[PDB]
Design a protein around this nucleic acid. Structure first.
Lengths: 71, 51, 151, 187, 103, 138, 65, 57
RNA sequence: GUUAAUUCCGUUAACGAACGAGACCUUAACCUGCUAAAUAGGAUCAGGAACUUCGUGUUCUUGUAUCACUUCUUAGAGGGACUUUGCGUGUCUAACGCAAGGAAGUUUGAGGCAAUAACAGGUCUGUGAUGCCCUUAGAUGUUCUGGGCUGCACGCGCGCUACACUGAUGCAUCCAACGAGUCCUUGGCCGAUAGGUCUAGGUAAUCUUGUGAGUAUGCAUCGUGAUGGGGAUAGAUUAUUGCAAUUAUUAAUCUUCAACGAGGAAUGCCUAGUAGGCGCAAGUCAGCACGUUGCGCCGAUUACGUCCCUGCCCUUUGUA
């Protein structure tokens, strides 16, 4: 069902798209988007390093669970 | 020539001293006792069952 | 609500046991590259690390982290050898349709890394005494980078 | 003191409604849901445990997932974090209000007056309504994420919030009204 | 004579057979008043066989749980070997294997 | 010197917590309590620190030596051995009235008692202890 | 249930007939007292008879038995 | 909707399999009802029907 | 009436007894007590290494090194629960329930032992336990070479692994108890692996071994696709046991990549360290466990009732 590459049309949107949402998970990326969970991990890892968003808890190795930054 | 294979190992090698039976051979601690033979004489050896 | 609790005093950073064991290996694996000394095998393309494992390791620095882990493990138990280190990296083999069992680790790769530490002279025999042990220069190599990682 | 995971305080908050009160075990309380202790020698030691312990305890199913309490501690520790994320207040007050509304009110027993297997209307006890609540919470969350690539913690967090709510989307709040469908008729 | 050290092994099936020997040989030493330490009771090596009760396969598959028990116990001394031969040779017990050993 | 040594027991685990006068350091074999994976149960070990307080323990040190049991059973042995240490530390040296405070606040919260549930033996004609195999009929 | 057989009854009943003097309502002196006057082989049996001796002494205190 | 009622005393145990259990209640008045699970004296429970009295036995 | 019980108190043309039950025996729970241990340790006192050099500041290591000790370890002697105490429940007799105390209060948990009658139960293939019959050299005795018990249109019974994301995979972290050996195997070199080779300790609380067991934990990649879940089916190669491996004894290395998406009607097992899951060890054994018998580890849900189903025990009752 799902798209595997970035899709560089939606990369310009994806800067705007994810910081709107209240829940930020593996699932909420492919909720808004229609791509496999794997991109979502490297997306929210990219949005840690470059972008805004922050960890709810320091970390875990299975369920990530970020918030919007609120700034 | 006749009347001997290599008879060194396996159940054909060895038999119960008391009844000459290979089957059910208890070889723990070097008993060489067929089980039918072993259970009835077990008290006389030393073995007393509890729990 | 932030996380509570400490120990009564702020914990001393001196010896290697005070360092968390995974975070030690993260530093000292990178130390093996940047120093240069240790030297590569030929066979690195093959392996997988065990008879039991059905696939090769993903990370290309699987040898350095293994040589990092084994060197600190000499400090935990002083006396050990190759059949000892086969047990410590044992794992669940999957037999097939049958039930699962234990299995021992690879003997080539675990022996070779020790011989490379012998060439520098951090871990050594012990020719009469059964089992390898770390020397004086082995400890000061470990304990100097124990203070660095927490810093 | 006493806080769950150290990020929450047992102190404060309140039971939602009359009944199912004192049956629940809050108030004092233990950081970490887990406790290995003797709770099954008498028949009302079962409502001495705090219900967060009874959630993690009954969250292990079926044959494959039984045991591994340490694993069920993690996914509940994530679930209470997510509950906090939406409609933030107290994960426990939302969870206590969920298990209030979760379990069924009435039930059909088989009393025939000799010969027949005939149904009859019977109200449910306060203990069984807590027993059924935590069971029905989980079996929604497990079934929701069984084939879907959604973490169980997500299902549990979602299931708990829904139960507090009157959405009826939940498996638990449906299976309340599915019993109360037939329990109305058996009067 | 010379300063020696002797540590005498005791083994049997019965408890009651050795508790004669442990009480007797320490009092036999305390005739001469040698440097006795008390009897060091080692862990019990319980032997075990489980056979089926029935000769043939019939009925429910029931099992015996047979057991031996073996009791290693050690009387300690510091004394020469000519002295100890009087103590051991008198008061030998029925069905108790005993072996004297220097060091 | 001030010394007491104490033991806890979960299942087949056992954990000899020696404790002495010193700086305020609590250690298993030679770790800090900060490690002790599983980490989730790390909080569990710190249980007698949280109830009693930090400023009691800073007069002493504790050094624990553990074997038997498993992962979870080793934590419950250390859990008991730290709590049993500081209670028993009074009897010898520190005033005997304050034992009744420090013990019964922990008892108000089996930290000294040790629950004796041990593994019941297997019996024949079945896989488990009480479990049996399967009857066939016809 | 903790119902005591006629071997347990007869022994404890025979003690209070003749050795009524001595033993008090208290248990932990009677446990000791029972062993000395009469032979009892096992440790479990000596408590069970001695408990019933103090049960009889309570009933003798309460009324005529 | 639901209206609460306090248990006076357990009366017996009812039905063929014996799972359902019979209770005298008091509103918050008295009548006899059947209840499912584990119940004891000094206990309070919700009823949708304030009427509908169970058979004595 | 009471009990797990023909177990008790009591009622009485019965009285006094015996076996079974109970007691008993073994094991599991708690003793800062008793009595000890160069074949279990701890603490000491002196030395070595490393970081710190903060200072007797944290962590490893050392010795018939010691003076002297027994909390864990081991096991002889013992103590300990009597439903003791409080309040209910009863001709308040036998005894129940609940709460407090306590290591422990279902007879404290779990087993061994097991009566009288029997059943045309099973075993002449456990036997030098045996009557009778058979056959006894062209053998149904015995023993040697080879095959067979493993042969497959298809029914039925105990088990194992599965269907996944509470997961699979790759790395790292660190924890058990029962055994068992004249074979169990450390140590060093060779080899991707299996395994081999040269030394080496062990008649075993001393050596293998503190058997660094796996569910578990931490950090990564995979993304709902029968996919990397699943590992059947199949070709080709390298070692191992044996005198001999083909119908392939196993163990490896590469491939080959099916059925199966929680199981129809029926029906089994089970109440607390229990169910279930996860390994380990022993028995048979030259070699082979998906089996049985024991052992621990992680550790829930739900009852504390009942005679509806399926059986059981005792009375009164009916019977061709």
């Amino acid at each position: 069902n799902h798209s595997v590459l970035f899709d560089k049309a939606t990369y310009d949107k994806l800067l705007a798209d994810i910081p709107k949402a209240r829940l930020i998970t593996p699932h909420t990326v492919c909720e808004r988007l229609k791509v496999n969970a794997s991109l979502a991990r490297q997306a929210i890892r990219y949005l840690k390093d470059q972008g805004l968003i922050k960890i709810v808890g320091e970390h875990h190795h299975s369920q990530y669970i970020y918030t919007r930054n609120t700034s | 020539l006749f009347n001997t294979r290599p008879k060194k190992f396996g159940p054909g090698s060895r038999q119960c001293r008391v009844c000459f039976n290979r089957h059910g051979m208890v070889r723990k601690y070097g008993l060489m006792m067929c089980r039918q033979c072993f259970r009835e004489r077990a008290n006389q050896i030393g073995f007393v069952k509890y729990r | 609500p932030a996380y509570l609790y400490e120990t009564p005093l702020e914990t001393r950073v001196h010896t290697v046991k005070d360092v968390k064991a995974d975070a030690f290996i993260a530093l000292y694996a990178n130390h093996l590259k940047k120093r240069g000394r240790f030297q590569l095998p030929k066979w690195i393309d093959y392996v997988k690390t065990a008879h039991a494992k059905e696939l090769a390791p993903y990370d290309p620095d699987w040898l350095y982290i293994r040589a990092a882990a084994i060197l600190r493990h000499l400090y935990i138990r002083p006396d050990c050898g190759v059949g000892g280190f086969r047990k410590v990296f044992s794992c669940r083999q999957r037999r097939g349709v049958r039930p699962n069992h234990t299995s021992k680790a690879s003997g080539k790769i675990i022996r070779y890394i020790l011989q490379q530490f012998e060439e520098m002279g951090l871990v050594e025999s012990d020719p009469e005494k059964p089992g390898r042990r770390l020397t004086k220069n082995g400890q000061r190599e470990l304990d100097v980078i124990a203070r660095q990682c927490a810093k | 003191e006493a806080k769950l995971f150290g990020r929450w305080s047992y102190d404060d908050v309140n039971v939602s409604d009359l009944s199912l009160v004192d049956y629940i075990a809050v108030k004092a309380c233990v950081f970490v849901p887990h406790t290995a202790g003797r709770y099954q020698k008498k028949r009302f030691r079962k409502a001495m445990c705090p219900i967060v312990e009874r959630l993690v305890n009954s969250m292990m199913m079926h044959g494959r997932n039984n045991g591994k309490k340490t694993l069920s501690v993690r996914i509940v520790r994530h679930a209470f974090e997510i509950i906090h994320l939406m409609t933030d207040k107290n994960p426990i007050q939302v969870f206590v209000n969920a298990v209030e509304n979760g379990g069924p009110r009435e039930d059909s027993t088989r009393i025939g007056s000799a010969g027949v297997v005939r149904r009859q209307a019977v109200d449910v006890s306060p203990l069984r309504r807590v027993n059924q609540a935590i069971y029905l919470i989980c079996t929604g969350a497990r079934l929701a994420a069984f084939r879907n690539i959604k973490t169980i913690a997500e299902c549990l967090a979602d299931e708990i919030m829904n139960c507090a709510k009157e959405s009826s989307n939940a498996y638990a709040i449906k299976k309340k009204d599915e019993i109360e469908r037939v329990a109305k008729a058996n009067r | 004579q010379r300063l020696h050290r002797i540590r005498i092994t005791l083994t049997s099936k019965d408890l009651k057979s050795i508790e004669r020997v442990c009480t007797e040989l320490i009092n036999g030493a305390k005739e001469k008043n040698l440097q006795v330490a008390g009897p060091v009771r080692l862990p019990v090596k319980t032997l075990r066989i489980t056979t089926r009760k029935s000769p043939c396969g019939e009925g429910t598959n029931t099992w015996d749980r047979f057991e031996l028990r073996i009791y290693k116990r050690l009387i300690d001394l510091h004394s020469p070997s000519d002295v100890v031969k009087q103590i051991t040779s008198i008061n030998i017990d029925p069905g108790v294997e005993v072996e004297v050993t220097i060091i | 010197k001030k010394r007491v040594q104490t033991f806890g027991r979960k299942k087949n685990a056992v954990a000899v917590a020696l404790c002495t006068q010193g700086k305020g350091l609590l250690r298993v074999n030679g770790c800090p309590l900060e490690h002790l994976q599983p980490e989730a149960l790390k909080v569990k070990a710190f249980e007698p620190l949280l109830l009693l307080g930090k400023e009691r323990f800073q007069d002493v040190d504790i050094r624990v030596r553990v074997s038997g049991g498993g992962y979870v059973a080793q934590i419950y042995a250390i859990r008991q051995a730290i709590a049993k240490a500081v209670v028993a530390f009074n009897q010898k040296y520190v005033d005997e009235a304050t034992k009744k405070e420090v013990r019964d606040i922990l008892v108000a919260y089996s930290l000294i008692v040790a629950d004796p549930r041990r593994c019941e033996p297997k019996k024949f004609g079945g896989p488990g202890a009480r479990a049996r195999y399967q009857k066939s009929y016809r | 249930g903790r119902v005591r057989t006629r071997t347990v009854k007869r022994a404890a009943r025979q003690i209070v007939e003749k050795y009524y003097a001595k033993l008090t309502l208290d248990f932990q002196i009677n446990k000791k007292i029972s062993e000395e006057v009469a032979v009892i082989p096992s440790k479990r049996m000596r408590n069970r008879v001695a408990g019933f001796v103090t049960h009889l002494m309570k009933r003798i205190q309460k009324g005529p038995v | 909707q639901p209206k609460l009622a306090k248990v006076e005393k357990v009366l017996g145990r009812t039905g063929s399999r014996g799972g359902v259990l019979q209770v005298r209640v008091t509103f918050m008045r008295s009548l006899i009802r059947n209840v499912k699970g584990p119940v004891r004296e000094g206990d309070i429970l919700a009823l949708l029907e304030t009427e509908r009295e169970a058979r004595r036995l």
